[PDB]
Amino acid sequence: VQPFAWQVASLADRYEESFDIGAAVEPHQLNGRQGKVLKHHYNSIVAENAMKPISLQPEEGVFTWDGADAIVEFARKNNMNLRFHTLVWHNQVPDWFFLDEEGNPMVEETNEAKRQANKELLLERLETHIKTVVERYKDDVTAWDVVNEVVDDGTPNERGLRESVWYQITGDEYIRVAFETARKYAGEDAKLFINDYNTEVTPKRDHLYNLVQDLLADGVPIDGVGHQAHIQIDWPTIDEIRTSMEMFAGLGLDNQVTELDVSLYGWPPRPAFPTYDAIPQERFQAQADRYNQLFELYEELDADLSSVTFWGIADNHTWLDDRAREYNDGVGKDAPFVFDPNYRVKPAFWRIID
Phi then psi for residue 52, to 5 deg, are: -80, 155
Q: Residue ranges for the binding site for Mg(2+)?
A: 18, 292, 302, 305, 351, 354
8 Å CB contact between 106 and 167: no
Which amino acid is it at 352?
I
* Per-residue binder mask for ligand XYS (CB under 6 A), 166-185, x = binder: --------------------
Among 15, 19, 98, 144, binds Mg ion (CB under 5 A): 19
Q: Closer to Mg ion at the Cβ: 19 or 339? A: 19
Give CA–CA dist 167/91, Å, rounded.
13
Is 55 a binding residue for ligand XYS by CB under 6 A? The answer is no
Q: Closer to ligand XYS at the Cβ: 68 or 186? A: 68
Closest of 276, 258, 269 to residue 344, by C-alpha: 276
Phi then psi for residue 46, to 5 deg, are: -150, 150
Point out the residues that are catalytic.
259
Helix and strand totals (H; E) in the chain: 12, 9
Q: Closer to ligand XYS at the Cβ: 26 or 289? A: 26
Is 289 a binding residue for Mg ion by CB under 5 A? The answer is no
Q: Closer to ligand XYS at the Cβ: 172 or 326? A: 326
Among 244, 287, 306, 318, binds Mg ion (CB under 5 A): 306
237 alpha carbon, distance to own chain's centre: 20
Q: How would you class 205 by CB atoms within 10 Å of its CB: exposed for 0-12, middle for 13-18, buried for 19 or more?
A: buried
Which positions ≥6 away from 203 have C-beta within 8 Å? 154, 155, 160
Among 10, 164, 243, 292, binds Mg ion (CB under 5 A): 292
Is 302 a binding residue for Mg ion by CB under 5 A? The answer is yes
Length of the chain: 354
Could you say which of ligand XYS, Mg ion, none residue 235 binds, taking C-beta under 5 to 8 angstroms by partner kind? ligand XYS
- Shortest Cβ contact with ligand XYS: which residue? 267
Could you say which of Mg ion, ligand XYS, none residue 230 binds, taking C-beta under 5 to 8 angstroms by partner kind? ligand XYS
8 Å CB contact between 131 and 95: no
Give CA–CA dist 137/84, Å, rounded.
9
Give CA–CA dist 100/306, Å, rounded.
41
Query: How many CB atoms neighbour CB 197 within 10 A?
Result: 19
- First vs last C-alpha separation in the chain: 20
Is 319 a binding residue for ligand XYS by CB under 6 A? The answer is yes
Q: Closer to Mg ion at the Cβ: 78 or 292? A: 292
The 8-class DSSP code of residue 136 comes to: H
DSSP codes of every residue in 249-283: HTTT-EEEEEEEEE-SS-SS--SPPSSSTTS-HHH
Could you say which of ligand XYS, Mg ion, none residue 145 binds, taking C-beta under 5 to 8 angstroms by partner kind? none
Among 2, 10, 49, 132, binds ligand XYS (CB under 6 A): 49
- What is the closest distance, in whole angstroms, from the C-beta atom of residue 46 to ligand XYS in the complex? 13
Is 318 a binding residue for Mg ion by CB under 5 A? The answer is no
Could you say which of ligand XYS, Mg ion, none residue 316 binds, taking C-beta under 5 to 8 angstroms by partner kind? none
Give CA–CA dist 10/122, Å, rounded.
45
Q: Closer to ligand XYS at the Cβ: 26 or 302? A: 26
* Per-residue binder mask for ligand XYS (CB under 6 A), 252-291, x = binder: ---------------x------------------------
- Shortest Cβ contact with Mg ion: which residue? 292
Is 244 a binding residue for ligand XYS by CB under 6 A? The answer is no
Residues contributing to the site for Mg ion (CB under 5 A):
19, 292, 302, 306, 351
Residues contributing to the site for ligand XYS (CB under 6 A):
26, 48-49, 153, 197-198, 230, 235, 267, 319, 322
